[PDB]
């Protein structure tokens, strides 16, 4: 298959380094602990203050791919536009699609058997993770039609939302049964 190298189709930058000493303010922060397996846990993001200029550089946009460049497990998420300004932390590497590839399509690939092999080959840490941007950006991805990526992305997203509905309903039912019994 034709392949484009990741660095030819994305703008890549590490996240902002924020000290534990920040005024819980207006801009949210995504950390390793907010990168869930089912997406980002937007409800528990740490808030803080940032100047307009420095904020504008690190501001996240709909469709950005967040990669755990530090930590103990290589998690990969796609950013969904939020009700407030959100930035990624310095332990995360941001991939902003330029052309050709969709953010979620890059997400599928890096979570594939080959994606893990290519990501672990870019790892400069033995026990902890130290992903190297240089080698990350050299990863080749098969290039397919944009409308076909979207079709698979629409099908991935609906299963993700349906997975949440199915999960919530099983919990909502179990709690109804549980309380139909305390009545006695």
């Amino acid at each position: 298959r034709e392949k484009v190298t990741l660095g030819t189709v994305v703008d890549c930058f590490k996240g902002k380094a924020v000290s534990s000493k920040v005024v819980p303010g207006d801009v949210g922060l995504i950390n390793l602990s907010d990168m869930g397996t089912l997406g980002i846990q937007y409800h528990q993001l740490r808030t803080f203050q940032m100047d307009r200029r420095q904020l504008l550089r690190y501001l996240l946009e709909d469709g950005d791919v967040l990669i755990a460049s530090k930590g103990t497990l290589k998690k990969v998420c796609v950013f969904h536009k939020q009700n407030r300004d959100v930035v990624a932390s310095s332990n995360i590497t941001v991939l902003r699609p330029q052309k050709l590839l969709r953010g979620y399509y890059i997400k599928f690939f890096l979570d594939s058997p080959i994606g893990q092999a290519l990501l672990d080959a870019a790892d400069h840490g033995k026990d902890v993770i130290n992903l190297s941007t240089k080698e990350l950006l050299d990863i080749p991805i098969p290039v397919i039609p944009l409308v076909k990526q979207d079709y698979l992305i629409n099908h991935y997203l609906r299963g993700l939302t349906d997975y949440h509905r199915k999960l919530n309903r099983a919990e909502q039912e179990w709690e109804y049964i549980q309380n139909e019994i305390q009545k006695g």
Binding site: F13, K14, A17, Q54, S90
Partner: peptide, 14 residues
């Protein structure tokens, strides 16, 4: 606040 990694990165990004 600017850190040495953020300044470095802006130099290597061009």
């Amino acid at each position: 606040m600017l850190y040495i990694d953020e300044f470095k990165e802006a130099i290597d990004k061009g």
